[PDB]
Amino acid sequence: PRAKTGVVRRRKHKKILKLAKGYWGLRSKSFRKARETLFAAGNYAYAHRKRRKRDFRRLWIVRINAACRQHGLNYSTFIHGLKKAGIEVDRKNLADLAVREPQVFAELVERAKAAQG
């Protein structure tokens, strides 16, 4: 029996061409240029997922180091404050608190410098 290519090849090409929807020029029209692009996008996403974690923390910090600079304070010290203050809270992420709950942040600033001043 002879098993011709048949229908199989067109299908694999369709699968990838669909993942390449919206890409520029041929990168979305040619199976080859599409597959090359997907390789790229595959590693970017993966690397960028690991560094999305970075880019946010970075943001949180800048946000914080500004709200407590309003209360005369280095971010660097503020953090040391909470470290010794026992306050293992903040979770830096939770400094929308510093933006949504200013009074609640201010009180933390106090407990902050309260220890090690």
Partner 1 sequence: MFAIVKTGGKQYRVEPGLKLRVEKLDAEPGATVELPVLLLGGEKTVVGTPVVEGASVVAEVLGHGRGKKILVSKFKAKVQYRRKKGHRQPYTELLIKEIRG
Partner 2 sequence: MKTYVPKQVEPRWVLIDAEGKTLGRLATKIATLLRGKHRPDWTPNVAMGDFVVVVNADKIRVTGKKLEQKIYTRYSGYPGGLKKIPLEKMLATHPERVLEHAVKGMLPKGPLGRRLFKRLKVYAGPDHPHQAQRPEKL
Partner RNA sequence: ACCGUGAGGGAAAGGUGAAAAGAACCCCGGGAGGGGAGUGAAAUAGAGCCUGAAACCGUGGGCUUACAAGCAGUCACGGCCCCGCAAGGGGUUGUGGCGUGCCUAUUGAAGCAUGAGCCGGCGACUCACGGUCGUGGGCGAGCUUAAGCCGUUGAGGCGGAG
Partner RNA sequence: CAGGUGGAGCCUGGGAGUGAGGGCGCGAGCGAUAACGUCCGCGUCCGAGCGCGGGAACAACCGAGACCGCCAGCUAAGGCC
Partner RNA sequence: GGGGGAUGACCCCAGGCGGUAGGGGAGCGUUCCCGAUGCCGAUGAAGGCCGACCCGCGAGGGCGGCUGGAGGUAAGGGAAG
- The site for partner 2 (CB under 8 A) is made up of 56, 59-60, 62-64, 66-67, 69-70, 93, 96, 98-100
| Burial (CB count <10 Å: 0-12, 13-18, 19+), residue 33 | middle
For residue 74, the partner it binds in partner 1, Mg ion, partner 2, none, with Cβ less than 5 to 8 A by kind, is none
Can you tell me the distance from the alpha carbon of 102 to that of 7, in angstroms, rounded to the nearest whole number?
64
Give which of Mg ion, RNA, partner 1, none residue 89 binds (C-beta under 5 to 8 Å, depending on kind). partner 1
* Angstrom distance (rounded) from CA 29 to CA 36: 12
- Least distance from C-beta 37 to partner 2, angstroms? 25
- The Cα–Cα gap between 72 and 52 comes to 30
- In the list 72, 91, 103, 117, the residue contacting RNA (rule: CB under 7 A) is 91
Q: Which of 66, 75, 53, 73 is nearest to 98 (CA)?
A: 66
**CB of 4 vs RNA, minimal distance in Å:** 4
Footprint of RNA (CB under 7 A): 1-15, 18, 21-27, 29-33, 36-37, 39-41, 44-53, 55-57, 60, 76, 79, 83, 90-93
